[PDB]
Amino acid sequence: GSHMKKVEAIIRPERLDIVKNSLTDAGYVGMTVSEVKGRDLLPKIKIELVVKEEDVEKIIDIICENAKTGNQGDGKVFIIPVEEVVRVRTKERGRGAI
Amino acid sequence: GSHMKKVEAIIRPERLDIVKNSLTDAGYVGMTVSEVKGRLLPKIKIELVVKEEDVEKIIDIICENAKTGNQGDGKVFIIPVEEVVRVRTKERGRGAI
Amino acid sequence: SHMKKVEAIIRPERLDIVKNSLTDAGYVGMTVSEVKGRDLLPKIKIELVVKEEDVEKIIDIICENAKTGNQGDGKVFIIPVEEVVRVRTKERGRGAI
Ligand SMILES: [Cl-]
Ligand SMILES: [Cl-]
């Protein structure tokens, strides 16, 4: 019961700003962005957020809300368990590190 | 039990098309592809979130088509996935897969 | 499964020291990718799937060699890995690592 989760979302590159700015506005700044390819192999954007479990549903809504375009290929959101999180700067561990 | 898993494989870049097409032929199209480095030589990472019962099937496909018989053929990892959500429809569980 | 994935996001200028330090400690199996983090500044992601007993030292190596004393040094995540398969020999479990 770590109560820490990784949110992994694959979205359209043209939806990054709207999804990033919407997340920033909700107080979710800890985010990793990478250029990938998905489903032909079209350029896509992967976003990763390691957060407190209680924040997962809120982030899903924000990602789901902003990323939607109503067309096929909008992307998916994955929830992956995280058993530990550590801050490199102070070696602090746990939910405090998030 | 979640019954949803993430298949994460690091493979040679020259084996991507052959592995991709093999998976598509077997009905596994949902896949994310990213360029990485490993050993620092360039490699290709493929990710598939699938139903648990399909894992063994996909492992076979990747291993059979990514293998060249030399060191560096890559490795396949299975990571638990507790939830999957479809952006277009917000469907969760195996339906979103 | 007693197998775990170590995923660390660090400053790009600390990759070599962390990379070389891990290999010096006997940790050669590692994947490196270029990513962005916060505003959307270049960062480096390093992934290692290892035996659970080795995680702690790897946390130590990454944290001690990636830290600079400034804010934004990065984080280390521990994710469960339920299976590892060697593409070439198709060997699974902790032996495959
Ligand atoms: Cl869709
Ligand atoms: Cl993962």
Author numbering:
A (entry chain A): -2 to 36, 54 to 112
B (entry chain B): -2 to 36, 55 to 112
C (entry chain C): -1 to 36, 54 to 112
The paper states:
PII-family proteins are key players in the regulation of nitrogen metabolism in bacteria, archaea and in the plastids of plant/algae. The monomeric unit, of circa 11–18 kDa, consists of two α-helices, four β-strands (organized in a double ferredoxin-like fold β1α1β2β3α2β4) and three protruding loops called B, C and T. In the trimeric state, clefts are formed at the dimeric interface through the interaction of the B-loop and the base of the T-loop of one subunit with the C-loop of the adjacent one. These clefts constitute the binding site for ADP/ATP, magnesium (Mg) and 2OG.
MtGlnK1 and MtGlnK2, crystallized without ligands formed crystals belonging to trigonal and orthorhombic forms that diffracted to a resolution of 1.94 and 2.30 Å, respectively. However, an additional electron density lies between the modelled GlnK2 trimers composing the asymmetric unit. The resolution limit, the high twinned fraction (0.39) as well as high translational non-crystallography symmetry (56%) and the poorly defined extra electron density restrained us from placing a model that seems to be an MtGlnK2 homodimer.
